[PDB]
Amino acid sequence: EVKPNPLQDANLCSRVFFWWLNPLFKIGHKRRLEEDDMYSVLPEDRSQHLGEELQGFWDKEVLRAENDAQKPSLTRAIIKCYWKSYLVLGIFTLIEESAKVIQPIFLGKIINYFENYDPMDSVALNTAYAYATVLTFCTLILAILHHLYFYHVQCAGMRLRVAMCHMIYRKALRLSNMAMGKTTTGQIVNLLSNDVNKFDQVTVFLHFLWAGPLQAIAVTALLWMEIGISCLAGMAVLIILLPLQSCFGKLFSSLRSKTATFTDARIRTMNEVITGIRIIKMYAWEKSFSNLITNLRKKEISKILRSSCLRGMNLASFFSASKIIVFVTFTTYVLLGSVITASRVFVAVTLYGAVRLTVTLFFPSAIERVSEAIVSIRRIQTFLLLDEISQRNKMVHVQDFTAFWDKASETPTLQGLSFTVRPGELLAVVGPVGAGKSSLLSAVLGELAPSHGLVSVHGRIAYVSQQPWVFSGTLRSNILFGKKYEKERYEKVIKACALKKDLQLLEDGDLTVIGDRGTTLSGGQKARVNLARAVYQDADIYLLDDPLSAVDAEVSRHLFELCICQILHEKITILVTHQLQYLKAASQILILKDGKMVQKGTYTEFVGFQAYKNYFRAGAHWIVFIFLILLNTAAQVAYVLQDWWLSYWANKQSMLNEKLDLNWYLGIYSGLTVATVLFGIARSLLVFYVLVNSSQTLHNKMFESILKAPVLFFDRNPIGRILNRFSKDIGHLDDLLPLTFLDFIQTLLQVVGVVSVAVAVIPWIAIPLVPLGIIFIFLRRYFLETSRDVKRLESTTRSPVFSHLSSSLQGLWTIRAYKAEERCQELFDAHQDLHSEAWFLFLTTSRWFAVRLDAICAMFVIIVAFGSLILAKTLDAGQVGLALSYALTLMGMFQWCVRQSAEVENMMISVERVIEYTDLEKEAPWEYQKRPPPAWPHEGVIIFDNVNFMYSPGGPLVLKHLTALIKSQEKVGIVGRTGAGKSSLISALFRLSEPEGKIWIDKILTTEIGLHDLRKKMSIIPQEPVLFTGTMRKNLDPFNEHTDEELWNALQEVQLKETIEDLPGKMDTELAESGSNFSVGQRQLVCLARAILRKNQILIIDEATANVDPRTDELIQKKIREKFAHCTVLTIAHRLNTIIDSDKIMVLDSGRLKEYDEPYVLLQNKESLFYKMVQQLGKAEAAALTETAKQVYFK
């Protein structure tokens, strides 16, 4: 075994404590870990073994189902597989529940000793030590041996999950093409990504389905023997809490899906902002999108906050549920007239303290997780019952072949086809079009079957689809594609593929790892690899579907004239290519149409504290948190004082020889119950409000930072990187972190409850508390330095599994062509177990930590129990019963406290990323001092003086010293080399980066006005037109300052009015995604309509009409020159004929003004680049251009 696994040989008292895992933490404390530091899985965890074993039952089970004439049952099959195993772990669950319930009874007798106390009876004292001893071992069961057990219940989960990933993939290769036609990859990948993943989460709780109810019965029976019928009072109320928890579960799922619509509506609208940002800014339409995102968020926040109230009240039930069921029990019990006594109260408090989790949380969860598992199985069953291809599947013969992609009602995909070919001969095929162009090959592969006629083949087939496909590994590994390596074969074919030079020049040699999803190769080179793979296999049958042979290249000739015509030509081969002239070398040509063989037409026939501060300060004044800190303690102190008051009552009562004032004691006691639920519920609402209001603020402080971010921000940051923060992180700050934080705080108080009660009742506990503390601090620090990293490795090692299935599910034909399932199965198993190696660490890592938290927690109970008995002269029965009833309660809650601590610390990083967006360097203000006068653009005069511009500070100067005059209403065409200068002068004109030099517009220096004062007052028509998901009215005027008449005129200025007024909303029609119902030219016509609405005296055309039919461009040209006669127009355009009649042209290259004059005068200088560019037209049209330019003198 490559990575020997210590679990093979660790002794019991190693693996009980996971002591064997110690070396991992040592190294993980010294280093960052890597995939070689993780252990290999034990033999039985191998995907192949589990799958082959489970098939060994599911196979039998479908045999039964056919023989019994019923639909089969996968749930029975896994059960029949795991029954003989999984029952054994039930035995520990049984003894575990016993320990949970037995502890109270002996907590009775150890308290009972104090009720009978005399300092001088050693015999009674020794009995108490025996009870205290068994109380320790009972704790030791729950606190130590529980952890090995829980790991094995987790292993039932992981073992079951892995086996399904095997059987699914095994099915996926056997899957019939029809079933693949009835399927999408996303279904199988999701099934593997999620729906099998549920099998861990059922198995942790499946034993609670019986052990929980059996627990509840036992607790009621015991209590009845302690407190009579009165135990029915609490237990019935406890059981009523079970539906009530479900009632909350129902509601927020409703409101969660109700909020889903708005995060989707927000995130789509946000994605338009982030991707569209540049053109958004030029229009000055921030305020439009600012209103949308604000209103959706303010809508979203209202429902998520209204859900947050119910989510808060839910935890308040978990806070009061012990206190309510205690109160009603003893109140009834007292009203049936019993005195209250320390022994009989704390037993019930402890029995309730034990059962409460089982009925209120584990069992409610379990019935849900079982329900999600059983639905997961039934779809997996559905998948495993899809149809399959017939798995059995020197010469090739075909005869009258009549076949379909599916037996739909249309005519067969192949019809009447017959041929035979023998080795040493090449067929070629003019195949179908609009359909399976290589359908003939697909028949030879047996992807299709005859309704009539026959195909017969012998030997082994090589195939390539015209679609390329590349396997996970190196390119050499793809050239091997699992076959043995053979240097001379490999050399000869790889050289005959001319691949070495390209592979050396472009892909670093054959050792190059093929990257994620095949990223590494160019598609042109990727295509050739398929043939290189094919030829390396030296198969009997070589089937070629157009390998971009249609692409003219020396290799696409060389492969044929040397390799395919001479080397490969000995083998059986069939070729489809557009290279019809290659088929002059073909031995035979088949031409096909409508599946018919139409002719044998042979060719000759032709995180630091500051994060917390920032997050909380964003919620409220610190004065509010002071009010909040009061409520926390008030809830917690009300909680403890209730149980202390119950002790105090018992202590007074047992002192009497005479009546108690029932309505004093029960009065105050009832008060603390009402108080503890009321502060508890109030606290639980307040925390959410403070934190959720904090999330709302961070979004709005952050969202404004995004609109006012300069374009430079969106150059450096990918769209996904930004948009993820608006989906994921602010998702968490609404969905889950306020919840997780309140649950952390709630539990932390309760731990502070037990510890502080314990030191109060027994002061000298305060000494050993500090050792336990410092032990915990070093433990947490030592642990999390590793666990943080294992979770990284686990999350990483997941991604090859889905990638491999996706790649393999894309390659199905090819895999079965090489009948290579026997290996590709092994590749999946290699990936699956390597993830399982990480999952095995993830399970056992947490236990090695969790067992110590329960170790030091187990040590605490010892301290209180024997500490109480040591101080027996001083303590008194009520106070001990308080201390011990709390001490037992620590066991469960303390582990949960630190789990949420780790999860909050991890999740809190989402807040750091959000705040890092709250302070991005802004542009200058939109509105600024020295506002331009009320009609400032009144001439369209522009000066550029020594203008210098860059896409980054200190970057390359893409404008150098650019200096120009543009006169009023002048029409300035601009052109240059492709990619030279480009829009940079436009982005300078919008100040999207601040230019050096000066730009003056209508006597105003552009660098001394607000960016909306500028950008509102100049139109642009962009390189790519943009529509926004919204009304046609908003896409034309979000401010609705233009009349519908003007909006109709604009749509009537273009052709499109009578294509929009017939849409049901008319101007108010909101569009499909990206306006798919409109053509690209029509989207530019929308920008022209926008421009026609704006009627600014300045317009910029950015090369737009290259997307558009010239006849629509002709309309654009017409309407520009008609409508913008008074306007000043700048026009970057590639084809000079669009601009040949400009009053002047600027030509830019290398960032310099190569030319600026009347275009004919530029042509009149035969040295000019403009003349040269017109001469580079290479055509007599240069004369028509020249004449048209000269006419500008005279027309």
Ligand SMILES: CC[C@@]1(O)C(=O)OCc2c1cc1n(c2=O)Cc2cc3c(CN(C)C)c(O)ccc3nc2-1
């Ligand atoms: C749901 C997770 C889990 O089942 C688990 O994976 O392992 C076992 C375990 C769990 C949860 C909780 N606990 C556990 O031991 C203890 C616990 C206490 C909780 C408390 C405090 N209790 C004293 C009521 C809460 O307020 C809210 C949620 C709580 N959840 C849990």
